[PDB]
Amino acid sequence: ENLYFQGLQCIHIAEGHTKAVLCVDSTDDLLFTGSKDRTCKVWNLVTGQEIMSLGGHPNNVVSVKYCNYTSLVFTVSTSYIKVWDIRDSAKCIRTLTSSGQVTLGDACSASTSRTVAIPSGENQINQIALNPTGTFLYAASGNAVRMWDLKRFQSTGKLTGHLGPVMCLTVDQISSGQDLIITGSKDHYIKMFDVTEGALGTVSPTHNFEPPHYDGIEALTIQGDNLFSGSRDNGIKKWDLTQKDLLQQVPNAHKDWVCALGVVPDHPVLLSGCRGGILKVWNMDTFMPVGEMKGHDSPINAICVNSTHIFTAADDRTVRIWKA
Template sequence: MRLLKFLLRYFPPGIALEYMQGGHVKTKIIDLLDLSAQTDIRDLAETIRASEPVITDRVMDQLVESLQKLQKKVCDTSMKRYYKYKTLKTQLCPLTNVAFDKLGTRCLTGSYDRTCKVWDIDSGKELLTLEGHKSVVYSVTFNNPTSDKILTGSFDKTASVWCSQTGHCLVNFEGHDAEVVVAKFSPTQNKVATGSIDATAKIFYLNSGDEVGTLEGHAGEIITLHYNNDGNEIITGSLDGIISVWDSRTLQRTSVLIGHRGGISNCSYNFDCSLIASSSLDNTAKVWDSRMNSCLSTLLGHDDEVLDLAFDNKGQKLATVSSDTTARIWDVSGSFQQLNLLEGHNEEISKVCFSPNGNQVLTSSLDKTARLWSLESGNCIQTLDGHTDDVFSCAFSYSGDTIVTASKDSTCIIWR
């Protein structure tokens, strides 16, 4: 074995060893979730070397330098304030969803005008218009981390993959009987999964567009879908109030998470896929043990429909937002207690996400604003004003240096 280089993963913290073995380049990721400002970096480097034969005396200084760089980035607790950098006058029709590429240099917008557009964050210029769908483009995503392909899902019952450099359509996926509202690349990037209003999900081969199979069993519309880390499992959330767990290799449903009394608005894995969280129109969120497929806790407190949720990057905290105009932060590492109540919006909150470093929470609302909150205090530290209609989506770039907000006013605002 011969070490080639170290690669840093900032959020959540980790370091990857890229090495040569048997003529093949391999990568091993070491999670460093407990890295803090108090961590002795030289002791940590010695611990890593003791368990990794590929690390020799020759590269120890480089390892220490890499870990110091990681520590500085991860342990920066400063509360960044953002300014309005660019307003992207995107499409004539209302937007549906937005997404960043891995480096935060480009973003996607889907629209009711049947297109997806690719934007340069620095210049604010439109790079590409992806045309071909015959109805609303609802779901948009890059195949991060490479970000060389774009996946769109449309109300025309199809999904498509596009080259992110040329805008050429590479492959179409057909077979659903109703609108496609969610589409995701598998972690191995050789398949894609789609979820539809027709109450099914489908898996397709990425290169050929051929259907691998259909995931059937829900009695209502599928509105959210996620792969686990190795791509061997998929969870789907439906308006039938059920979360289904599927083996993506056998196409069999391996478990059904039952307990909500209303439709599912979102569901998601945490970082290590040990937990699944679900939000529901029954005014609650639930946290499930993904290995035992059992409910660990029902999170009570919201007075209206819970519309979205998000784990922090370490998977130890959960944010929920509701039509009751509040957001709530929960400890999901053991106690399942509410940590903070975030109050300040005066209309329903549609989306929530954590900053990459986990110090801030971002929410978007029908009150035409997005807000940044301190995770420690629960106070609103900045209101992002500038839209003239509902703000329905918001996202951080990977580094946390940039925010995008998307509105029913057909614009996106880039904040830096």
């Protein structure tokens, strides 16, 4: 009868974190969850079993990315990125700082507390992104994005031009040896950077997307030439990455902050999640609504996808696994 997208069904709940789950990443084999409980959990997606716990974070784990090619996990807490080789055990091989410092092993050795202790010359790292090849990491901190060469674990430069903290970012490759970085800021703006891989020094934007959201940018996701943005203004926008202008928008798409976006595997459907715990789905071509459902009975912090499933992370200490 009807083979098209109908809705999402929750097939499993990943439980074990003791506090809010702030971030998720997934391959077809592994799930990565970062929490206010100061850990990242690695999960076997075939069995749902926790494989290992990546600890020693001074505070919340706000962003986590895995590079399948190199088997490296990148976890973010305060002004630190911890780099884990998880082939055998929870082995921290590097700690990177917001300022470009590199420690061999685990630098998060200082006494921990429940009080912010980010010193002068460091900033909170709000989010990281890998390029599709896993050769570069982009780390949003203060009003800039630091570029990390992952073959050397050394910083090459910064993406500058935002006037408030860079809160989110996403990276694509549309050309040979060129990374496309989209940034979202507390300043309400979305910017585009075009970087030749390994280029040294400070890089200014190629484009500012207009007209902007009315409040901070919380979420970004790309499918093909389309960029989707979610904001504290409770709105979603669709941008053309080629023409660099607005295609579709839903102001007041949710009744609260749009904190998470993802593209439903195999369907032309955008999923949005808000601080109200609501999941909405939109036709990506027209922004026609095609469904509303309760995601969680708590704020949703993050969405990620693999080839077959969708994942939501919430304040309720869980990740829900969804299938179309």
